[PDB]
Amino acid sequence: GKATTEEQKLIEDVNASFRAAMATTANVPPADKYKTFEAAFTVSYKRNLADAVSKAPQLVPKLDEVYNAAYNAADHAAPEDKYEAFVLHFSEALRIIAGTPEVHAVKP
Ligand SMILES: [Zn+2]
Ligand SMILES: [Zn+2]
Ligand SMILES: [Zn+2]
C-alpha cells in the first residue's frame, strides 16, 4: 500500500546518494578514498534519513542497521580495506532490508 511505496522510494533515494558518494572517490588516492567517501556520504544520508523519519518512520531502524553494518565493517578493517568494506556491507544490507533475494552482486 502507501507505506511500502514510500519505503521503496526512500530506499531508492538512499541508494542513489550512496552511489554519488562513491563517485567522489574516482581520482582520489587510495589512502584518501574512505575519508572522502564518508564525508560525502554523511551529508546526503542524513538528509535521506530525516525524510524517512518524516514519511516512513517504520523504516528508520532498518536504515540504522544498514548504516551500522557498513560503518562497523569499515571501523574494523585495515585502512587500505575500509572503503571496500563499507561499500560491500552497505550495498548488501540495503538489499536485505529491501527484500531483494540476490544479495551478493551478480556480475552482468
Ligand atoms: Zn566494532
Ligand atoms: Zn542468481
Ligand atoms: Zn557477498
Residue numbers in the entry: 2 to 109
From the study:
We used the grass pollen allergen Phl p 6, which is a small globular protein of 11.8 kD that can be easily expressed in E. coli and is a known inducer of TH2 responses. We selected single point mutations that either stabilized or destabilized Phl p 6 without changing immunodominant T cell epitopes or the overall structure of the protein. Using these mutant proteins, we investigated the effect of fold-stability on antigen processing and presentation, as well as on immunogenicity and immune polarization in vitro and in vivo. Based on this concept, the overall fold-stability of an antigen has been suggested as an important protein intrinsic parameter that can influence immunogenicity and immune polarization.
Such replacements have been referred to as “hydrophobic core packing” and reported to have stabilizing effects on the protein structure by increasing the overall hydrophobicity within the protein core. As predicted by MAESTRO, mutants E39L, N16M, and S46Y displayed an increased thermal stability compared to the WT protein (ΔT +8.8 to +14°C) whereas the destabilized mutant L89G was less heat stable (ΔT −5°C). A more detailed analysis with X-ray crystallography of mutant S46Y showed that the 3-dimensional structure was remarkably similar to that of the WT protein. The superimposition of the crystal structures of S46Y with Phl p 6 WT revealed that the overall fold is identical, with a total root-mean-square deviation of 0.42 A. As shown in Figure 5, the introduction of Tyr46 in the α2 helix, pointing into the central hydrophobic cavity, contributes to hydrophobic interactions with Phe42 within the α2 helix (and also Tyr68 in the neighboring α3 helix). We found that peptide 92–106 was much faster and more efficiently processed from L89G compared to the WT, whereas presentation was almost abrogated in the most rigid mutant S46Y.
